[PDB]
Nucleic acid binder design. Structure first.
Ligand SMILES: Nc1ncnc2c1ncn2[C@@H]1O[C@H](COP(=O)(O)OP(=O)(O)OP(O)(O)=S)[C@@H](O)[C@H]1O
Ligand SMILES: Nc1ncnc2c1ncn2[C@@H]1O[C@H](COP(=O)(O)OP(=O)(O)OP(O)(O)=S)[C@@H](O)[C@H]1O
Ligand SMILES: Nc1nc2c(ncn2[C@@H]2O[C@H](COP(=O)(O)OP(=O)(O)O)[C@@H](O)[C@H]2O)c(=O)[nH]1
Ligand SMILES: [Mg+2]
Ligand SMILES: [Mg+2]
Lengths: 330, 327, 332, 352, 258, 257
DNA sequence: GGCCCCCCCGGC
């Protein structure tokens, strides 16, 4: 890095350095701590969605096992590096079959993002794993399990990283506020959690954007309005009004309301559709085909939007689909 | 295999067939007697049916089974036959014949030949199976037609599924290289379309003709491009426009006057060629494009040989301009 | 200069010329004094000012001297395969920052990192994209990444999570009129009231198209040499907008319901060269905004128009799609 | 030389139809220094290329019509040597990248950037020998380019705006992506009217000494062209050559072979609806496709000939047009043309 | 009717090899004064001029000027099969569809005469009117090779700057930057390794790796080069012949920042 | 300039650079008043290369403050190849340098070549890895070691070194066969350069890879004698003494199982 | 020993 850590992005500035700074994975953290505290550390397969803390967890585990000079005693290979059949055959085999250099210890290999590896390399790694197990251990981090061969999966103990719970995100937010001397309104916190979807990177990015948006962070408190302005996401009140107008009001006034709501803050149609879907998922419908039509038509509209096209036609289609689906209620 | 093509007519071809169950009965009984294990003759044929003409494989089977089991009778023949079944990938013709059979798609057949089995059959040769299915799905007598459904409706549904499978295949071989969709292409190209017209073939199975048509179309496009870039300096149009609109008018000037004035139209044809930088090979290519009732093969053949010889001599007796240099 | 198109001549040079993207421009300006610029993912509709915004930010951050040595820009016109990403991008990111000169350190903030701008990132393959996940994280302290795309769904989830998302809003008459008016005054273009608003409405969130239309109208007025103010009819003619009379005839033929007459009228209409997308948009506006139709008719026509637009967006024949849409509407 | 080519106008003042378009082109060419990128769209055979050449002649000198053809070599990722025929002029360049199929992107990433990244030597009409102007590149059939080529062009047309200018001619804007449309100035070229086509044909006849008893003769040719002018001129030439340079009131309209084949296919499908009929239609489709007949044109003509049948009813026509609309998108998203043409024919036969 | 008996056929072989890559179809006008040729690059960006005077040829005569568009690749194919020391001649006739290359020798046995087809190439009234070029100099070719091959591995630019008492080759790229300065240096015992340079105004022009690399591939023709740089005219690289020279007008690259 | 180091001959630096370019890729140089040190770790994390060059190897050397320079060995070798073998080489660096300048100057002529290599951000420490008291040490001519390594690497990819009472044994076990070479220490007073010395504290038996030994013996052109130090639970040390500095290869023995 | 080039799979 350059200068100091204050110039780093919040996503990288607040990267955990030890295992006790990882939140939302109490079971996995306790299990790995117990494993590394009594010498029985098996091969690990950390499977989870982005932003859960798998890389941070493995880095902290390596630091605890080896210490400050852990970078020179582990072999970290990721998608950014070339990992082919020849690499597995030569470099990984040599690392697993050779003693340590700086200090006595066992060999650790971290194959981050191994789901992007070829099948030949995965097949080759089987005997490398099963032959040098006495002095070497393997850790594989993945987001999609279908990319891993069954043979590789059989040789690794599986640990699943769940989406971050609400309390963990609140604790991390409180720590960040304490470090940055910032104040957050409770409604702003709830909106941040709602839009976070269990990813801490989104929390940090949105919080940094909100801090940058404030006129003076020293004596300004971030509110839900600030978060909505920074992210441009529709407000819940706007979504409720749009849904109400679509459901009860006629075509002309519903179209006018949708246009006015979208043009007031430059809202995007996809976010409105997502919010309407979330709101309607809790509706106690009396018929099934109505829900079927809603889901199918909204998925079609989302797919069409993903490829671009006329936005006004897409909004009219959304309104018409909702009206037609709710017509079946009778 | 195509690699054997050079050996087509340079060696005496000797073909060996799978030995019958009666040509090896005596040898196998002698082996059983010598090795002191009982081998019931009545179950011998199944062994060959299990090994499918492989004497070495059946000998190895006997050697392995006799290690701990000294009796080979009908009580355990089924187990060994099931355990030692040989799996060989079917050829494209065999794949098409089996996939277009209505027995496997019935309620009873489906429990024996499952969907996974059909997908594996497709995967035995995934580069030919869709073509064979698309070629041979119009020559069947379906036996799985739904009550009230006609053959034409099933054919239309199969064609729609084939089009969807073609779209999937195009997406598979794109820059993204989405090969994980190959199993889906198995259903949309081979299994599903065959499931609607499954039955008995109405005739011999024909190999796909799409490859030859594609090669011919590529050659025709190459000749059309050559002609278009040879006449680019004179015409204001593209190759598609040249083929659709210009070629009939050109025929009206480069072929018609040979059929009326005889050998006196050579000068005009040569003048047209010079004006449009056309050559004799370009003439042949252009006259070969026409289809329908405007075929020129018979007309060209009926032209007197003297006229053609004079035209060739005139063309070769003078200099002509060249449009593109070092083509 | 005078030898450049108005779209390029009036391209923003600094961050203060951005009109309707304040929600992100304010954050970018604050990053100048905060010096903690994160990885950015600029997404939005075409012609919103993303590349211009990033260029202005890089200029204001580094200076014309350090721009070349601190910026690495890769777009769809360069090979960006997995090997290129793994070698060239990795090497540039892992390099040390160029040493600023006292002049630059005096007149510019000179942040202690370099910027890699991956424009048109939506065209990169998933395998190539996956190679940057650790590259951005490992060298975040010396390098920052800017990914510009039009379709946010084309970016893999890990990269979107790593990057801070910035959505560029559409430029309509309510937020981009000031820039168009300023350009008109700078070029001394005389227009009637509502002409600029009509241009922006026709553009539908594309300021580049509006500027091009204004330039074409100014050229036509100058060639005319009459001094009269530019009207809206000429602007509509230059924008390929179907005349209202033709639309009235189209809807009357649709109401007639006869297949042969509709087919003949469509055959005659397609010889004028009108774009199918404009016709569909005008028909949608007329039918949706009309109060002479019931709920069911609008419910069906909305889906019909959506399907027609989706099919047309895939690059199909306009004649067949237009005829099918008109026939379907006539049977509603 | 053919009459369609010998009488092509070579200046903006020689145009004989769409006077408003001519005035717009003259206005654009009045101050060509700040001319933006241009995209011409309209029906085929109306004169878009002729108008582009006239505009270039207005901008530069008459020397834009001295053309040459050269060969360019390109190498793909597999060390495959590909040849491209480049039509060039001292003042402008012309390219048709679609001739290299999916490799068209290479032309965008290798050729265009080579011309736009640096200057040129102009030893004529100059004092220093270096060009003091921009170069106009005409990308013929922009609608045929792949999405990757257009994405590559997006930045090329912007970062070299004042060194290179692009004039792209196409018959339809549907395949064109939104960014390319935004970066281009749209120009619509309507097809000539019947009266203008008749006047042009009459001028050709009177300049070629062709006997014509009634002018209505030419009028029919116009109703047989459906707005196309090149087709009208070629049909007039063919009729004159087939009638001893004398058109009669009883002279029939000469149709191209592929149209007759499509008509045979249509009136065989209508008469007979069976699997064997579908096999024969497959053979006919193979014959049509093998001789450089685009699948989209075949589908369009088949659909519009089916809709012209006097025995079919409204429901049958609606089903046919719906199936044609679906299968046009299927063709646009597929590789094997027959795989979709057969499906369309089968659906049509089922619906009848 | 025309003959160009050469002192050395290797001289003509190197002359043709010096610009075979740049252009392939060039018109040769054979006047009593000598041979003249000027071909525009297919991209209309590089002009290959060339002229050989009557002095260079062992015995040159012509009765009527004739322009031959004969190919260059075929020229190399014909000349590659020949020996080293010979007296190539270019005999032709009144209406030549081919030119007979008489590969005469002092000995009566080592003769490899051939025939080369002629091809119609159009020629225009191109002009090379002189301009007040700011700088012009000449220096050996070995230094050119050692500099261009060195700088090409570091960048695609071989930028040339010519200042008073200084000649700078600059090449910056992703790996880094490299600059080599050559200065007036005269050796009394070895005059061949000397630079003859005259400049009027400072000049700097960026040139490309591929163009100069191709040019120095053909630099075996002349042991000395000629640089001519101006401010608004295409700078030209020349290779001196026995009595003429082979010029290369190469357009400088466009500068976007300035 | 801040750091200016002048070499007597460019070949002097070129030979040392070539001595370990084929085993490591990225190098880090620390320049101080005492001299220039560098440590490189290969990708497999098996071999470590430690080079030190003193001030006595430079004609003129000046370094006001410590300088850390990260470079790619391939790029440095390419740039050195671009330079000639008869010119004077100067290392030039400034405060907080973003690049390193290599200056090639010819005394006969007035030609000066200034190459610039962009520096690399490699944040790492040295850790001064060196065992205080090795189990056994030995010294022998480099040519003999290279010959033995090349001979025994043709039979197998692994070589075992045994140090025992007044004897050193190199054993290779392969598929086509096996080979053994035994050498006993001796002292010659008329060719001291050919003598072999050995001082042992405990017997040693360590296995190493053949490829790493083949790459290590490539530095035989920088010295006539090589010192091999073996110790249990410690990397094996291979030292080549230079005119005023030294080069060291630390090789981790293979796991025994 | 190192490039450079050509042929061939790619799902479970
Ligand atoms: N459990 C966590 N506790 C605190 N911060 C977290 C946690 N998980 C993620 N983060 C934060 O998000 C940043 C990125 O976490 P990562 O370790 O990169 O997630 P990841 O699971 O490795 O992402 P993938 O699966 O490779 S896309 C960290 O630097 C933390 O600042
Ligand atoms: N926010 C804006 N403010 C002022 N002018 C703008 C703005 N956005 C676009 N323009 C104008 O339109 C021209 C083109 O803007 P662009 O930067 O190319 O838009 P864009 O977002 O990059 O389009 P895409 O998504 O890459 S196709 C600019 O030179 C400006 O003249
Ligand atoms: N007399 C006259 N003929 C025209 C004019 N425009 C086009 N044409 C004729 O119509 C022919 C076809 O036009 P073309 O440029 O190919 O149209 P495009 O293929 O759609 O671009 C031309 O070769 C001309 O002969 C015009 O303005 N006046
Ligand atoms: Mg991670
Ligand atoms: Mg842009």
């Amino acid at each position: 890095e350059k200068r100091s850590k204050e110039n780093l992005p919040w996503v990288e500035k607040y990267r955990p350095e030890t295992l006790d700074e990882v939140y939302g994975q109490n079971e996995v953290i306790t299990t790995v701590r117990k494993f590394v505290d009594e010498g029985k550390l098996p091969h690990l397969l950390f499977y989870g969605p982005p932003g859960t803390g798998k890389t941070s967890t493995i880095v902290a585990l390596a630091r605890e096992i080896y210490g400050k000079n852990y970078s020179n005693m582990v072999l970290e290979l990721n998608a950014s590096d070339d990992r082919g059949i020849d690499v597995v055959r030569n470099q990984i085999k040599d690392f697993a079959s050779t003693r340590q250099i700086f200090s006595k210890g066992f060999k650790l290999i971290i194959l981050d993002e191994a789901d992007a590896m070829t099948n030949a390399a995965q097949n080759a790694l089987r005997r490398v794993i099963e032959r040098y197990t006495k002095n070497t251990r393997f850790c594989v981090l993945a987001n999609y399990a279908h990319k891993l061969t069954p043979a590789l999966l059989s040789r690794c103990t599986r640990f699943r990283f769940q989406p971050l719970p609400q309390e963990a995100i609140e604790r991390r937010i409180a720590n960040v506020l304490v470090h940055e001397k910032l104040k957050l309104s409770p409604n702003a916190e709830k909106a941040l959690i709602e839009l976070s979807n269990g990813d801490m990177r989104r929390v940090l990015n949105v919080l940094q954007s909100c801090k940058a948006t404030l006129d003076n962070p020293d004596e300004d408190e971030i509110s839900d309005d600030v978060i909505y302005e920074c992210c441009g996401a529709p407000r819940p009140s706007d979504l409720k009004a749009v849904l109400k107008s679509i459901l009860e009001d006629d075509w002309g006034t519903a179209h006018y309301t949708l246009n006015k709501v979208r043009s007031a803050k430059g809202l995007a149609l996809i976010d409105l559709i997502e919010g309407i879907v979330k709101i309607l998922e809790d509706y106690e419908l009396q018929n099934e085909e109505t829900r079927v039509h809603l889901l199918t038509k909204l998925a079609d509209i989302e797919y069409s939007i993903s490829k671009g096209g006329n936005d006004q036609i897409q909004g009219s289609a959304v309104i018409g689909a909702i009206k037609a689906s709710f017509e079946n209620e009778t | 295999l195509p690699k054997m093509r050079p050996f087509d007519r340079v060696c005496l071809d000797i073909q060996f067939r799978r030995p019958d169950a009666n040509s090896i009965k005596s040898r196998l009984m002698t082996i059983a007697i010598r090795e002191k294990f009982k081998l019931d003759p009545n179950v011998i044929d199944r062994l060959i049916q299990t090994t499918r003409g492989d004497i070495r494989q059946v000998i190895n089977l006997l050697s392995t089974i006799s290690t701990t089991t000294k009796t080979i009778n009908h009580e355990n023949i089924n187990e060994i036959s099931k355990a030692w079944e040989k799996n060989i990938a079917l050829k494209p013709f065999d794949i098409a014949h089996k996939m277009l059979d209505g027995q496997i798609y019935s309620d009873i057949g489906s429990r024996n030949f499952t969907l996974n089995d059909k997908i594996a059959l497709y995967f035995d040769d995934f580069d030919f199976t869709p073509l064979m299915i698309q070629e041979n799905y119009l020559s069947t007598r379906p036996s799985v037609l739904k009550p009230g459904q006609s053959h034409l409706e099933a054919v239309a549904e199969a064609a729609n599924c084939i089009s969807l499978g073609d779209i999937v295949e195009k997406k598979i071989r794109s820059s993204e290289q989405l090969w994980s969709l190959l199993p889906l292409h198995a259903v949309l190209s081979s299994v599903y379309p065959a499931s609607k017209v499954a039955g008995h073939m109405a005739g011999r199975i024909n190999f796909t003709a799409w490859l030859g048509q594609n090669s011919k179309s590529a050659k025709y496009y190459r000749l059309l491009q050559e002609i278009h870039y040879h006449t680019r300096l004179g015409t204001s149009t593209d190759k598609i426009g040249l083929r659709l609109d210009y070629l009939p008018t050109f025929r009206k000037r480069l072929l018609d006057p040979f059929l009326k004035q005889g050998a006196d139209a050579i000068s005009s044809v040569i003048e047209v060629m010079d004006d449009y930088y056309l050559t004799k090979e370009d003439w042949d290519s252009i006259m070969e494009f026409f289809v329908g009732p405007d075929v020129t093969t018979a007309i060209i053949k009926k032209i007197p040989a003297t006229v053609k010889s004079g035209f060739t001599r005139k063309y070769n007796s003078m200099t002509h301009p060249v449009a593109i240099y070092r083509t | 200069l005078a030898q450049q198109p108005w779209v390029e001549k009036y391209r923003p040079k600094n961050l203060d010329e951005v009109t309707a993207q304040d929600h992100a421009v304010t954050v970018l300006k604050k990053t100048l004094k905060s010096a903690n610029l994160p990885h950015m993912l600029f997404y939005g509709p075409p012609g919103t000012g993303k590349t211009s915004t990033i260029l202005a930010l890089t200029k204001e951050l580094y200076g014309p001297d350090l721009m070349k040595s601190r910026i690495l820009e890769l777009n769809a016109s360069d090979e960006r395969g997995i090997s290129i990403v793994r070698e060239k991008v990795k090497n540039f990111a892992r390099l040390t920052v160029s040493k600023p000169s006292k002049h630059d350190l005096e007149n510019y903030p000179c942040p202690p990192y370099k910027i890699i701008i991956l424009d048109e990132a939506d065209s990169m393959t998933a395998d190539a994209q996956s190679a940057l996940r650790r590259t951005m994280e490992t060298y975040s302290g010396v390098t920052r990444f800017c990914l510009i795309c039009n379709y946010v769904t084309r970016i893999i989830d890990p990269l979107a999570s790593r990057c801070s998302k910035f959505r560029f809003k559409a430029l309509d008459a309510s937020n981009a009129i000031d820039r168009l008016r300023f350009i008109s005054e700078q070029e001394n273009v005389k227009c009637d009231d509502g002409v600029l608003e009509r241009i922006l409405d026709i553009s539908a969130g594309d300021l580049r198209r509006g500027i091009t239309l204004l330039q074409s109208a100014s050229k036509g007025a100058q060639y005319l040499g009459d001094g009269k103010n530019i009207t809206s009819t000429q602007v509509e003619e230059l924008a390929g907008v179907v005349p209202h009379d033709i639309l009235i005839e189209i809807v009357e033929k649709v109401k007639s319901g006869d297949f042969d007459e509709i087919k003949k009228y469509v055959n005659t209409f397609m010889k004028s060269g009108w774009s199918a997308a404009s016709v569909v948009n005008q028909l949608h506006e007329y039918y949706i905004t009309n109060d002479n139709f019931d709920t069911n008719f609008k419910n069906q026509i909305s889906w019909l128009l959506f399907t027609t637009d989706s099919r047309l967006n895939n690059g199909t024949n306009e004649h067949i799609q237009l005829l099918n849409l008109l026939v379907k509407i006539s049977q509603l | 030389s053919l009459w369609v080519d010998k009488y092509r106008p070579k200046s903006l003042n020689a145009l004989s139809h769409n006077e408003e378009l001519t005035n717009f082109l003259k206005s654009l060419s009045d101050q060509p220094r700040d001319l933006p990128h241009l995209l011409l769209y309209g029906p085929n055979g109306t004169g878009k290329k002729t108008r582009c050449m006239a505009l270039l002649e207005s901008i530069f000198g008459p020397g834009v019509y001295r053309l040459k053809i050269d060969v360019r070599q390109f190498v793909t990722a597999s060390n495959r040597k590909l040849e491209l025929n480049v039509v060039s002029s001292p003042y402008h360049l012309e390219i048709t990248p679609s001739d290299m199929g999916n490799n068209d992107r290479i032309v965008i990433q290798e050729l265009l950037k080579e011309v736009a990244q640096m200057e040129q030597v102009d030893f004529q009409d100059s004092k220093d020998g270096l060009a003091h102007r921009y170069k106009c590149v005409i990308i013929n059939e922009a609608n045929s380019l792949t999405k990757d080529a257009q994405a590559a062009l997006r930045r090329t047309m912007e970062k070299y705006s004042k060194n290179i200018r692009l004039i792209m001619v196409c018959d339809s804007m549907s395949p064109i992506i939104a960014p390319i449309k935004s970066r281009c100035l749209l120009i619509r070229c309507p097809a000539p009217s019947d009266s203008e086509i008749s006047t042009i044909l009459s001028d050709v006849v009177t300049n070629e000494r062709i006997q014509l008893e009634t002018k209505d003769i030419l009028k029919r040719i116009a109703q047989a062209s459906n707005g196309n002018l090149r087709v009208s001129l070629l049909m007039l030439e063919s009729m004159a050559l087939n009638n001893e340079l004398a058109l009669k009131s009883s002279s029939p309209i000469i149709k191209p072979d592929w149209i007759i084949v499509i008509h045979k296919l249509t009136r065989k499908i209508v008469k007979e609806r069976s699997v064997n009929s579908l096999i024969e239609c497959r053979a006919v489709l193979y014959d049509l496709l093998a001789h450089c007949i685009p699948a989209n044109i075949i589908l369009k003509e088949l659909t519009f000939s089916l809709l012209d049948v006097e025995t079919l009813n409204t429901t049958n026509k609606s089903s046919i047009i719906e199936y044609s609309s679906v299968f046009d998108e299927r063709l646009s998203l597929g590789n094997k043309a027959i795989f979709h043409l057969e499906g369309f024919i089968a659906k049509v036969m089922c619906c009848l | 009717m025309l003959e160009a008996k050469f002192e050395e056929a290797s001289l003509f072989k190197r002359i043709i090899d010096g610009f075979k890559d740049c252009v392939q179809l060039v018109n040769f006008q054979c006047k009593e004064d000598g041979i003249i040729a000027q071909a525009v690059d297919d991209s209309r960006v590089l002009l290959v001029s060339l002229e050989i005077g009557v002095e260079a040829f062992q015995e040159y005569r012509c009765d009527h000027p004739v322009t031959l568009g004969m190919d260059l690749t075929s020229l190399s194919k014909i000349l590659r099969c020949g020996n080293n020391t010979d007296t190539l001649t270019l005999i032709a006739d009144n209406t030549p569809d081919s030119i007979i290359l008489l590969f005469e020798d002092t000995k009566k046995d080592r003769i490899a005469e051939y025939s080369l087809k002629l091809m119609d190439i159009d020629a225009d009234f191109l002009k090379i009117e002189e301009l007040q070029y700011d700088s012009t100099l000449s220096l050996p070719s070995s230094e050119f090779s050692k500099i261009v091959r060195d700088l090409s591995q570091l960048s695609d630019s071989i930028n040339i700057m010519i200042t008073k008492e200084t000649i700078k080759f600059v090449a910056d790229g992703d790996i880094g930057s490299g600059s080599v300065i050559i200065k007036p240096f005269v050796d009394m015992e070895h005059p061949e390794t000397s630079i003859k340079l005259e400049m009027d105004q400072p000049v700097d022009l960026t040139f490309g790796a591929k163009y100069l690399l191709d040019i120095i591939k053909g630099s075996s023709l002349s042991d000395r080069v000629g640089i001519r740089l101006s401010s608004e005219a295409p700078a030209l690289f020349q290779f001196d012949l026995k009595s003429g020279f082979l010029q290369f007008f190469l357009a400088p690259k466009f500068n976007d920042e300035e």
